[PDB]
Amino acid sequence: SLSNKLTLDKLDVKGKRVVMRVDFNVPMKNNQITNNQRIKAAIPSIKFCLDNGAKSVVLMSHLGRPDGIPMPDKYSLEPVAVELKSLLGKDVLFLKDCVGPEVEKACADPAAGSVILLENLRFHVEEEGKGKDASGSKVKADPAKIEAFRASLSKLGDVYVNDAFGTAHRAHSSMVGVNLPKKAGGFLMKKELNYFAKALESPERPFLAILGGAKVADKIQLINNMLDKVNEMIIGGGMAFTFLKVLNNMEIGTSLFDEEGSKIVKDLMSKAEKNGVKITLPVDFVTADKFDENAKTGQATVASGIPAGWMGLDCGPESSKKYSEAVARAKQIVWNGPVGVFEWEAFAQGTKALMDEVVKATSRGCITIIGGGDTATCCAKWNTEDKVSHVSTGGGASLELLEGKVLPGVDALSNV
C-alpha cells in the first residue's frame, strides 16, 4: 500500500506550476544555519521539476516554533533562500508571506523556471490548526480562517508535491489541506515509502529489529508491532534495565527504571515467545557514578549487578559481541534508538561498535534502515549516512509508521 502512492518521477510537470512542501527546518545558531543538510536533501526533487519543464516551483516549509504568530527576527526562512541559491546555482525569489492576494499574484504566472520560497508556514495559526498568542495563552484556529488559508495555498500551483516526510504524521494544512488534482511524494518521500514498505510489508529474512532509547512505556506499541514482523530483536539502551530487573531480578542501582513499563515486560516476552521471536538483551555494561560526560567509570554484568549510586550508561564488550552475532545473521535490519548514551564519548562505544557492524552488514547485501532522530544523528556524527541503505529524515513520523499508524500526509497523497 505504501508502495501504491504517486511519486514525482511518475508526474508530468512539463509547463506546470509546482507547489512543493519541503523540510527546511534547519538548525540555526542565531541567524546562521549551523547545518544545511535538509536543504541539500531537497535539491534532487526541485531540480527534477526545473529540468523537466515545470513553469515554476513554489517552496513552502516551516522553521522552529513560532507557534502561529509571526516572528521573522527569530524563525524567518530568509537565511534559507540565500543558502538555496548557492546550492541550486539559481536565483530564488523570497516572499515575506505564504498566503494572501500579493503572494497569489506573484505565483499566478511566474517567469518560467522560477524558484519561489514562501515565508514560514507556522507564522499562521491555520497551518498547525493551533498555536499560542504573545500572552502565552493557547489559541485554536478558526475553521473559516483555516479554509481560506488552505484555498490560498491551493492557488499557488497546479500540482502538489510533498517531500517533507518528517511532518507527514501531522494533519497540518500544508500536509493535508492543498486541494489539487494530483499530489505526489517527492524523491525524499519516495525513499522513505519504499524502505519502510520493506520494514512493514515484504521484509527480507531474517529480519532484525534493534530497539534502544531511555523509556519503555512510550515504546510499547512500537515493540508490540515489531514483534509481529521480526524474527529477532535486540533491546538495548536504558530501556533494557527495566527488562533485566523484572526478568532476572538484576540489581540496577540508579539506572533508568520505567515503573509503568515494568508491569508489561513479561507480557512482551510472552508475545515474543508465541511468535518465535528471539530476544537479545545486554549482559554487561559500562557504569557511571553520575549522569555526566566527565563521570567516573566502571563495569558490571547481569550476574554482578550494578552498585548503589551507579548507573549503566552503555553496554559492555560481551553485549557488543552478542549484538554483532545478531547482525551477522540478519538479511534486513531496522535500528531505532542508541544502545547507550551516544552523546558522551565515554558512553558511545557500544553504539559506535554496533554501527560498524551494521555498516559491514550493508556491504554484504543486508538492507539496513535507520530511524529518524538520535539514531539518524549517529550517522552524521560518524559519517555513515552513505554506508547504510536508508536513514530516515523523520524521527517521530518514522516512529508512528513502525507503530503501524497511518500517516495523514502519506494518506493524502494520490494512489497508483
Ligand X SMILES: Nc1ncnc2c1ncn2[C@@H]1O[C@H](COP(=O)(O)OP(=O)(O)OP(=O)(O)O)[C@@H](O)[C@H]1O
Catalytic, out of 16, 17, 21, 38: 38
343 interacts with ligand X by CB under 6 A: yes
* CB-nearer residue toward ligand X: 186 or 312: 312
* CB-nearer residue toward ligand X: 184 or 239: 239
Cα gap 398→381, rounded to integer Å: 20
Cα gap 351→247, rounded to integer Å: 24
215 interacts with ligand X by CB under 6 A: yes
Smallest distance, Å, CB 349 to ligand X? 12
Interface positions, 255-274, toward ligand X (CB under 6 A): 256
Interface positions, 238-257, toward ligand X (CB under 6 A): 238, 256
Q: Is 157 a catalytic residue?
A: no
Q: Dihedrals φ, ψ of 20, to 5°?
A: -130, 125
Closest CA to 240 of 338, 377, 325: 338
- Which amino acid is it at 217? A
316 interacts with ligand X by CB under 6 A: no
# chain residues binding ligand X, by CB under 6 A: 16
Q: In this structure, are residues 38 and 26 in contact, taking their beta carbons and an 8 Å threshold? A: yes
Q: In this structure, are residues 60 and 82 in contact, taking their beta carbons and an 8 Å threshold? A: no
* CB-nearer residue toward ligand X: 147 or 291: 291
* CB-nearer residue toward ligand X: 206 or 344: 344
Binding mask 89-118 for ligand X (x = CB under 6 A): ------------------------------
Cα gap 338→154, rounded to integer Å: 41
Smallest distance, Å, CB 407 to ligand X? 18
Catalytic, out of 215, 322, 331, 360: 215
350 in a labelled binding site: no
Query: Interior CA angle at 229 toward 226 and 231, to 5°?
Result: 100
Interface pick for ligand X out of 110, 131, 312, 316 (rule CB under 6 A): 312
Cα gap 169→207, rounded to integer Å: 25
Q: Is 15 a catalytic residue?
A: no
23 in a labelled binding site: yes
Q: In this structure, are residues 281 and 240 in contact, taking their beta carbons and an 8 Å threshold? A: yes
Collapsed DSSP state (helix, strand, coil) of residue 58 = strand
Q: In this structure, are residues 200 and 371 in contact, taking their beta carbons and an 8 Å threshold? A: no
Cα gap 170→394, rounded to integer Å: 12
Q: Is the backbone of residue 76 left (phi > 0), alpha (psi -120 to 50) or beta?
A: beta
* CB-nearer residue toward ligand X: 159 or 250: 250
Q: In this structure, are residues 404 and 221 in contact, taking their beta carbons and an 8 Å threshold? A: yes
337 in a labelled binding site: yes
Smallest distance, Å, CB 225 to ligand X? 16
Smallest distance, Å, CB 295 to ligand X? 12
Q: In this structure, are residues 237 and 338 in contact, taking their beta carbons and an 8 Å threshold? A: yes
Q: In this structure, are residues 376 and 370 in contact, taking their beta carbons and an 8 Å threshold? A: yes
214 in a labelled binding site: yes
Residue 48 C-alpha cell reads as: 527534477
Catalytic, out of 177, 316, 373, 395: 373
* CB-nearer residue toward ligand X: 68 or 338: 338
281 interacts with ligand X by CB under 6 A: no
Residue 8 C-alpha cell reads as: 514525482
- Segment contacting ligand X by CB under 6 A, of 87-95, 185-193, 335-343, 381-389: 335-343
Tracing cell 541567524 back to the chain, one arrives at 31
Question: 138: which strand partners?
Answer: 132
Q: State which H helix or E strand residue 275 sits in.
A: helix 265-275
Tracing cell 538555496 back to the chain, one arrives at 84
124 in a labelled binding site: no
Interface pick for ligand X out of 213, 261, 316, 409 (rule CB under 6 A): 213
340 interacts with ligand X by CB under 6 A: yes
120 in a labelled binding site: no
Residue 334 C-alpha cell reads as: 531496522
Interface pick for ligand X out of 237, 261, 394, 409 (rule CB under 6 A): 237
337 interacts with ligand X by CB under 6 A: yes
Query: Beta 232-235 vs 183-185: how paired, if at all?
Result: unpaired
- Segment contacting ligand X by CB under 6 A, of 23-31, 212-220, 382-390, 403-411: 212-220
Q: Is 21 a catalytic residue?
A: no
Active site residues: 38, 215, 373, 396
Binding-site positions read 22-25, 37-38, 61-62, 64-65, 121-122, 169-170, 213-215, 217-219, 237-238, 312, 337, 339, 342-343, 374-375
Residues that bind ligand X (CB under 6 A): 213-215, 237-238, 256, 312-313, 337-338, 340-341, 343, 373-374, 395
Going by the annotation, the residues of the binding site for CDP are 213, 218, 237, 337, 339, 342
